Design an enzyme around this catalytic site. Structure first.
Site, PDB file in Angstrom:
ATOM      1  N   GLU A 193       0.857  -1.176   0.000  1.00 15.92           N
ATOM      2  CA  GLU A 193       0.000   0.000   0.000  1.00 15.92           C
ATOM      3  C   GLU A 193       0.898   1.233   0.000  1.00 15.92           C
ATOM      4  OE1 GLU A 193      -3.815  -1.080   0.025  1.00 15.92           O
ATOM      5  OE2 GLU A 193      -2.299  -2.262  -1.004  1.00 15.92           O
TER       6      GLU A 193
ATOM      7  N   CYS B 199      -1.133   9.190   4.009  1.00 17.14           N
ATOM      8  CA  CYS B 199      -1.186   8.728   2.629  1.00 17.14           C
ATOM      9  C   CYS B 199      -2.391   9.310   1.909  1.00 17.14           C
ATOM     10  CB  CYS B 199      -1.256   7.212   2.585  1.00 17.14           C
ATOM     11  SG  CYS B 199      -2.650   6.547   3.500  1.00 17.14           S
TER      12      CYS B 199
HETATM   13  N1  LIG Z   1      -1.513   3.437   0.886  1.00 12.75           N
HETATM   14  C1  LIG Z   1      -1.340   3.440   2.330  1.00 12.75           C
HETATM   15  O1  LIG Z   1      -2.091   2.819   3.002  1.00 12.75           O
HETATM   16  C2  LIG Z   1      -0.221   4.247   3.018  1.00 12.75           C
HETATM   17  C3  LIG Z   1      -0.326   4.488   4.372  1.00 12.75           C
HETATM   18  C4  LIG Z   1       0.622   5.201   5.026  1.00 12.75           C
HETATM   19  C5  LIG Z   1       1.713   5.696   4.318  1.00 12.75           C
HETATM   20  N2  LIG Z   1       1.824   5.472   2.976  1.00 12.75           N
HETATM   21  C6  LIG Z   1       2.996   6.015   2.270  1.00 12.75           C
HETATM   22  O2  LIG Z   1       4.318   5.911   3.212  1.00 12.75           O
HETATM   23  C7  LIG Z   1       5.181   6.806   2.739  1.00 12.75           C
HETATM   24  C8  LIG Z   1       5.855   7.613   3.892  1.00 12.75           C
HETATM   25  O3  LIG Z   1       6.152   6.783   4.961  1.00 12.75           O
HETATM   26  P1  LIG Z   1       7.680   6.134   5.041  1.00 12.75           P
HETATM   27  O4  LIG Z   1       8.729   7.256   5.094  1.00 12.75           O
HETATM   28  O5  LIG Z   1       7.798   5.245   6.269  1.00 12.75           O
HETATM   29  O6  LIG Z   1       7.913   5.266   3.654  1.00 12.75           O
HETATM   30  P2  LIG Z   1       9.294   4.433   3.245  1.00 12.75           P
HETATM   31  O7  LIG Z   1       9.068   3.792   1.895  1.00 12.75           O
HETATM   32  O8  LIG Z   1      10.458   5.363   3.181  1.00 12.75           O
HETATM   33  O9  LIG Z   1       9.580   3.294   4.420  1.00 12.75           O
HETATM   34  C9  LIG Z   1       8.551   2.359   4.784  1.00 12.75           C
HETATM   35  C10 LIG Z   1       9.260   1.051   5.345  1.00 12.75           C
HETATM   36  O10 LIG Z   1       9.963   0.463   4.417  1.00 12.75           O
HETATM   37  C11 LIG Z   1      11.433   0.145   5.036  1.00 12.75           C
HETATM   38  N3  LIG Z   1      12.347   0.051   3.927  1.00 12.75           N
HETATM   39  C12 LIG Z   1      12.990   1.047   3.312  1.00 12.75           C
HETATM   40  N4  LIG Z   1      13.712   0.520   2.323  1.00 12.75           N
HETATM   41  C13 LIG Z   1      13.516  -0.812   2.312  1.00 12.75           C
HETATM   42  C14 LIG Z   1      14.006  -1.827   1.510  1.00 12.75           C
HETATM   43  N5  LIG Z   1      14.930  -1.742   0.376  1.00 12.75           N
HETATM   44  N6  LIG Z   1      13.640  -3.078   1.718  1.00 12.75           N
HETATM   45  C15 LIG Z   1      12.787  -3.361   2.723  1.00 12.75           C
HETATM   46  N7  LIG Z   1      12.305  -2.372   3.510  1.00 12.75           N
HETATM   47  C16 LIG Z   1      12.670  -1.097   3.297  1.00 12.75           C
HETATM   48  C17 LIG Z   1      11.649   1.137   5.852  1.00 12.75           C
HETATM   49  O11 LIG Z   1      12.599   0.746   6.943  1.00 12.75           O
HETATM   50  C18 LIG Z   1      10.263   1.375   6.482  1.00 12.75           C
HETATM   51  O12 LIG Z   1      10.056   0.521   7.531  1.00 12.75           O
HETATM   52  C19 LIG Z   1       4.362   7.759   1.883  1.00 12.75           C
HETATM   53  O13 LIG Z   1       4.712   7.642   0.589  1.00 12.75           O
HETATM   54  C20 LIG Z   1       2.876   7.282   2.099  1.00 12.75           C
HETATM   55  O14 LIG Z   1       2.035   7.619   0.910  1.00 12.75           O
HETATM   56  C21 LIG Z   1       0.869   4.748   2.310  1.00 12.75           C
END
Ligand SMILES: NC(=O)c1ccc[n+]([C@@H]2O[C@H](COP(=O)([O-])OP(=O)(O)OC[C@H]3O[C@@H](n4cnc5c(N)ncnc54)[C@H](O)[C@@H]3O)[C@@H](O)[C@H]2O)c1
Ligand SMILES: Cc1cc2c(cc1C)N([C@H]1CN[C@H](C(=O)O)S1)c1c([nH]c(=O)[nH]c1=O)N2C[C@H](O)[C@H](O)[C@H](O)COP(=O)(O)OP(=O)(O)OC[C@H]1O[C@@H](n2cnc3c(N)ncnc32)[C@H](O)[C@@H]1O
Lengths: 1197, 112, 56
Positions: free
Chosen positions: A776, A810
């Protein structure tokens, strides 16, 4: 640094014994409140008999004495009457009376009314006038047909009669006058007959400083005109004024109490000083329940202010439908004694009932602040009248009611001795020998609408006196029934209304709603202050919690994003070796956790929900300090975590059995922006589906994650089933790459999801199937506003959607699209509202917007803003206090764009982009919104049904919102999740979610459809014609099994309709190996409404010769998959090596993450569900605010 | 009452479109409207805007709105019965234009 | 009954719709079948007449 929560929400003044008794009564059970009111309202048999006689005489007179005449005269239908009045309204907007008549005679009466903003923007109001019923939105195509029909039939004469009728109603019936001077002139008549007046200048709910100044100078100028006309008649015989405090300050709320006392109070005082000089009454109208006790602080300061001494004109409304009413009266009577001022107390029943029910349900509070049975309000009113009549030496009671039974009971209660000044009655303009004060609205047609709808709704409710007095089925004997004796004889005195759900019971037997907290309640704020302070004294830690025990690692502190000097706790991060060890441990624990029966797993989730509910205040404090959230948003987040736990528990009890086997170890990777709710939701679903979980929280927010795991383990989840691995993405990557990882749940950026998909594309499960990924991701969420929307509603929903949580949702509003004709006015209001927001460290209730999560986030957001500013785009920003320098803050920002294409990627911060559009370009605009490739949340503000139907049918987004904000999706009510670049699905908090976490999906509750796709049927006939009888039967079976066309309404709060529907996904990539495989893939795709692109490299073109045109329209052949996307899914046939190679090619396709399903030829032969139809439809959630027109139609019953 | 194909021309007898066939300018029947807009009509109007045919694009949008395609009514009648009345597309319309503008107007009407 | 209903229905539809701009066609020839020799006979004639057309 200031101490955490030391200044969270200090009360305006120390709460006296009398004030504390008010607060204690706020939400007490209705069975507790009523018996004392019954006792206080009881009168002697002789008086009750006299009252019934008097009430009968009044009612007989009313029934022995307009628009309906017009309807009768021209035999208009209802829609014709509404359309005619909308036309007359529009024609009266033309000032020059001769110019209007020429337009009527030469243009309008000749049918071409269209060639001369929709005509029907206010049709809901005229609907109320014509039919007595409220419709939330306007069927403008029905009204246009009706107006054409009636003009073509009756011509100029009916238009003339319509104009003269609308002129009389809007200038003389809805209002006493258009201006105070006009209203005063028209008041001479009834004043000579003994009436008096209270004038209402019709301001309320200021959105901006300029709005509040405008309402202030309206009140000030009215006081002068009223005082000049009063000419020393005094406060009882002469006219007065009524004001609404919400008109005088744009942030009139308990959360902004300091600003209210510092900025609003001086304004009320200046108005009161003017009323004192003219010796006229100045009355404070009563509004929403959460403003009652705040207004008492203003009343107290004003009554104690020596500059106002010598004047008894200050007045205050109290609402008898409120549970605090008697205690508020005790406070006011004592204030009157202390101050020596004879406070004028207007007793009303209450004007905001529908809204109070909806608010309490949405906020999940213990009970309502108002009664739920109308007869309870009647008893309360009479009991409070007895209290007031016993204190006429210190207060001036004003009994504001039109109910003849209520009036007669009070009339006889008051007794025979009367003098002018002892008490009075009051009535609303347009609806014995005792004085009567007329509440007189003053204003132009435009300014009247909110008040008018509220008024007409009351008159149309079945329980209202005005509706019943006009219903011929209601006998006078029913109308004069004593509410006191009817309640006294009830089986349970004060029972809640049978058809209104307590907030806890919104979902009935399915599950218990999460409970919130009332941040307008002083007792709540006082206890929450202590719990928040105590949470900041705790030494929070997050450790790698493996099945065998806590592991060692690199330790660092966790800092408050709003103030880096505030150390929240410490995190020990996971080594890549320990991450791989955890997966191996989870793999070895998988059979034991799978063997816990689904009902017991669900019981663990319900137990954890109870623990989180009990620990909410402490959890709030950690979320506020670790994630930078406000208290309001932290409450909503804890509620969401509780709802996820209880929702997935119930879905499990409804579905999971022995044949739905777990996948195995699931890696749950969660984001920092909902560090408890999304964290809990992913882990809870995976656990309850029988999978052991590796939980990898975002690097920024490990403490609340560790606390969530502690609660889950305390509830019974074994350490081997739930392991916590704090750290950065390298930990995430190690977990994803681990050999025994059986599925991945990811919420985060699209880029990182794409990196995870790439890592999983090389992988197959032991059974040779793709590893499931639920991802998501972001959204570029838009809201479209047309010229029929109400600017004040729009601005409130825009400010909330774009800047709540610093835009770090989000679902946050990123692009506001304003119809050109209203763009300037809405932008001006929006900028004004922007400047009323308080930004700062979120351990103060007064803070609206907190920090962004990191300095890197800040730098990235500010780089975008400066690029826009460098391109010359208009940028509005509010100034940040110097205190913000110790944290990482971005000021809420509005950027005006030329084209939607000015935006590249999602900007995850408090940055709203604004574009303008011409109405004829709406369809093109929806195309441009869809063309970003995102599809998460979408908002539409309009009153016009044609526009709703057009936009909602063309927009491609997972969560739609009509006439409300676009944030804060509620579990099981707005199942949340988008399409395209926004997600793979299935939706979190929806009924398809758990089936993705087991090897064989169950049948979700209510998951079926009686509709069969017609192209599927055409394809099955074609198969029968080619002799492929088995495949033709399989196709027909897919047509029946498909749930395409499912269309459900989900239970939720009153005043909202929450819809859930299953649609086609789009174009599905088919990668077949055999002819029979292609037929099965095509049947599955067509049965779920999709088109297909078939891999031309399969060489199976000859297998689809001479297709029916209907099927051929859906079929294309693809030699370059990347050129023919975007796709919405893929079906693959082949052995393990083929599936792996295709999976890698699909992962390399640009754009969205595709949900891929694979099967061998043999599995297609053996298993009719080789391809799951659940994953070939797209869920859409739509939430419609049905109270948007100003009230609740259903609650009027 | 009345059918299509070999069963007759319409409009239905005892229905709201009948009298309009017997006058030179048909009126708007009671309840005859629809909030739905045909999506292909919408695409055609956008195409017309793209080539600057502003009057035809305007005509197409007005046809899209005034079309009663998608009307879906329940008619009053006896208890124990549900009597429904709906307006659907007719099928394939033969267009015999003389001018380009004529063709655009005919296409707008049929697509709407 | 059907003949009566045609009469009353087309009368009501006329009251709801027809104005000065809805001009009649002119003489209408109404040709009716033997299987409903009153009802369909009446329905066609009533509609043509009430729309302002003389009938053969
Ligand atoms: N559609 C939804 O339900 C929803 C809900 C909340 C947030 N979001 C999105 O989240 C984003 C912002 O939050 P964020 O800064 O935590 O996002 P992010 O992508 O930077 O990180 C999310 C998770 O992924 C981990 N991660 C990072 N790189 C990785 C990799 N190569 N492999 C495995 N794991 C990895 C991170 O440690 C973290 O725990 C926004 O883009 C938002 O739109 C979407
Ligand atoms: C006569 C009058 C009434 C009100 C005011 C002044 C005067 C002179 N004040 C006005 C100023 N602001 C209001 C506005 O809309 O802008 S009008 C006033 C009122 N209400 C407020 O909350 N604040 C104010 O400052 N006035 C309206 C008044 O509260 C009431 O709504 C109407 O007067 C109708 O009451 P009525 O007694 O004449 O009619 P009844 O039918 O006997 O009662 C209707 C009321 O009963 C309550 N109710 C309905 N259904 C209920 C259920 N299921 N449970 C519990 N209570 C129920 C409602 O209060 C309903 O109005």
């Amino acid at each position: 640094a200031p101490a955490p929560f030391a200044d969270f929400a200090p009360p305006v003044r120390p709460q006296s014994t009398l004030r504390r008794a008010i607060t204690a009564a706020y939400r007490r059970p209705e069975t507790e409140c009523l018996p004392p009111l019954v006792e206080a309202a009881t009168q002697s048999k002789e008086i009750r008999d006299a009252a019934a006689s008097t009430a009968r005489k009044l009612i007989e007179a009313l029934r022995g004495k307009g628009v309906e005449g017009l309807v009768q005269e021209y035999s208009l239908s209802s829609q014709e009457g509404v359309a005619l009045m909308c036309l007359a309204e529009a024609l009266l907007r033309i000032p020059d009376t001769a110019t209007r008549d020429a337009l009527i005679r030469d243009k309008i009466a000749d049918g071409n009314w269209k060639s001369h903003r929709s005509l029907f923007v206010n049709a809901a109001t005229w609907g109320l006038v014509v039919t007595g019923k409220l419709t939330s939105t306007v069927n403008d195509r029905s009204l246009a047909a009706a107006l054409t029909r009636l003009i073509s039939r009756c011509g100029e004469p009916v238009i003339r009669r319509g104009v003269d009728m609308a002129m009389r109603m809007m200038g003389e019936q809805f209002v006493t006058g258009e201006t105070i001077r006009e209203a005063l002139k028209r008041s001479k008549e009834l004043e000579e007959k003994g009436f008096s007046y209270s004038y209402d200048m019709l301001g309320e709910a200021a959105t901006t400083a300029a709005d509040a100044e405008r309402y202030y100078r309206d009140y000030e100028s009215a006081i002068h005109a009223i005082g000049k006309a009063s000419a020393g008649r005094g406060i009882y015989e002469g006219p007065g004024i009524s004001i609404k405090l919400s008109a005088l300050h744009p942030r009139y709320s308990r959360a902004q109490a300091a600003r209210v006392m510092g900025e609003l109070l001086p304004r009320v005082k200046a108005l009161a000083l003017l009323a004192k000089n003219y010796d006229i009454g100045l009355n404070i109208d009563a509004e929403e329940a959460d403003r009652l006790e705040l207004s008492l602080d203003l009343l107290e300061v004003l009554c104690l202010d020596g500059d106002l001494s010598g004047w008894n004109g200050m007045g205050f409304v109290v609402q008898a439908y409120g549970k605090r009413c008697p205690f508020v009266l005790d406070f006011i009577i004592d204030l009157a004694r202390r101050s020596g001022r004879r406070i004028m107390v207007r007793l009303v029943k209450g004007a905001y009932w529908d809204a109070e029910i909806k608010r309490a349900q949405l906020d999940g509070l213990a009970d309502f602040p108002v009664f739920t049975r109308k007869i309870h309000t009647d008893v309360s009113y009479i009991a409070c009248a007895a209290k007031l009549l016993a204190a006429t030496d210190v207060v001036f009671p004003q009994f504001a009611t039109h109910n003849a039974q209520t009036l007669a009971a009070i009339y006889h209660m008051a007794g025979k001795d009367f003098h002018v000044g002892k008490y009075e009655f009051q009535c609303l303009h347009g609806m014995l020998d005792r004085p009567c004060r007329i509440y007189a609205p003053v204003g132009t047609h435009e300014t009247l609408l909110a008040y008018l709808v509220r008024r007409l709704l009351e008159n149309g409710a079945n329980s209202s006196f005005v509706h019943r007095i006009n219903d011929p089925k209601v006998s006078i004997d029913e109308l004069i029934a004593d509410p006191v004796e009817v309640v006294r004889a009830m089986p349970v005195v004060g029972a809640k209304h049978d058809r209104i759900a307590l907030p806890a019971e919104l979902f009935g037997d399915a599950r218990t709603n999460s409970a919130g907290l009332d941040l307008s309640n002083e007792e709540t704020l006082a206890s929450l202050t202590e719990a928040l302070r105590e949470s900041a004294a705790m030494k929070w830690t997050a450790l790698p919690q493996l099945a065998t025990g806590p592991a060692a690692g690199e330790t660092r502190t966790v800092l408050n994003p709003g103030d880096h000097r505030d150390v929240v706790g410490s995190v020990t991060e996971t080594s890549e070796e320990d991450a791989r060890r955890a997966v191996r441990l989870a793999a070895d624990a998988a059979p034991d956790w799978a063997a816990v029966p689904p009902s017991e797993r669900a019981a663990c989730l319900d137990r954890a929900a109870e623990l989180m509910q009990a620990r909410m205040p402490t959890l709030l404090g950690l979320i506020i300090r670790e994630a930078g959230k406000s208290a309001l948003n932290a409450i909503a987040e804890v509620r969401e975590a509780i709802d996820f736990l209880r929702y997935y528990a119930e879905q499990t009890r409804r579905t999971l059995g022995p044949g739905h086997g777990p996948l195995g170890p699931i890696v749950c990777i969660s984001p920092w922006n909902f560090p408890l709710a999304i964290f809990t939701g992913q882990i809870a679903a995976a656990l309850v589906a029988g999978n052991p979980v590796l939980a990898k929280p975002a690097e920024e927010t490990p403490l609340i994650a560790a606390e969530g795991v502690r609660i889950l383990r305390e509830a019974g989840i074994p350490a081997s089933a739930l392991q916590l691995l704090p750290g950065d993405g390298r930990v995430g990557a190690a977990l994803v790459a681990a050999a025994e990882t059986a599925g991945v749940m990811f919420t985060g950026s699209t880029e990182v999801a794409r990196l995870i998909q790439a890592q999983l594309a090389d992988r197959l499960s032991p059974a040779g199937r793709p590893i499931p990924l639920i991802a998501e991701t972001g959204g570029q969420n838009a809201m479209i506003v047309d010229s029929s929307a109400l600017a004040e509603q729009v601005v409130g929903d825009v400010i909330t959607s774009a800047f709540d949580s610093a835009g770090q949702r989000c679902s946050a509003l990123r692009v506001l699209c304003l119809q050109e004709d209203v763009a300037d006015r809405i932008l001006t209001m929006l900028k004004g509202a922007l400047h009323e927001l308080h930004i700062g460290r979120t351990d103060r209730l007064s803070v609206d917007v907190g920090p962004v999560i990191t300095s890197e986030a800040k730098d990235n957001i500010e780089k975008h803003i400066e690029r826009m500013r460098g391109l010359g785009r208009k940028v509005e920003q509010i100034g940040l206090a110097s205190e913000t320098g110790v944290g990482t803050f971005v000021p809420p920002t509005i950027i005006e764009l030329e084209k939607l294409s000015d935006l590249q990627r999602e900007v995850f911060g408090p940055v709203l982009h604004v574009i303008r559009y011409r109405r004829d370009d709406l369809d093109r605009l929806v195309d441009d919104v869809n063309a970003t490739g995102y599809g998460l949340t979408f908002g539409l503000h309009t009153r016009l049904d044609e526009t709703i139907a057009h936009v909602t049918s063309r927009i491609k987004a997972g969560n739609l919102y009509i006439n409300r904000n676009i944030i804060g999706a509620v579990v099981g009510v707005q199942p949340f999740g988008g399409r395209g670049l926004s997600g793979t699905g299935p939706k979190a908090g929806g009924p398809l979610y758990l089936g993705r976490l087991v090897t064989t999906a169950p049948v979700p509750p209510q998951h079926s459809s009686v509709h069969t796709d017609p192209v599927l049927l055409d394809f099955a006939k074609w198969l029968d014609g080619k002799g492929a009888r088995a495949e033709a039967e399989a196709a027909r079976n897919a047509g029946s099994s498909s749930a395409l066309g499912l269309d459900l309404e989900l239970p939720g709060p009153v005043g909202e309709r929450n819809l859930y529907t299953l649609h086609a996904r789009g174009r599905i990539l088919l990668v077949p190996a055999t002819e029979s495989g292609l037929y099965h893939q095509l049947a599955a795709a067509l049965a779920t409404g999709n088109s297909v692109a078939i891999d031309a490299a399969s060489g199976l073109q000859a297998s689809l010769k001479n297709l029916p045109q209907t099927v051929g329209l859906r079929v294309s052949w693809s030699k370059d998959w990347a050129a023919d996307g975007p796709f919405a899914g893929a079906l693959v046939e082949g052995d393990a090596e083929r599936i792996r190679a295709v999976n890698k090619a699909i992962a390399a396709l640009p754009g969205p993450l595709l949900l891929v399903q694979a099967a061998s030829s043999g599995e297609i032969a053996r298993n009719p569900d080789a391809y799951c139809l659940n994953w070939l439809v797209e869920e859409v959630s739509a939430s419609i605010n049905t109270a948007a027109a100003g009230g609740n139609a259903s609650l009027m019953a």
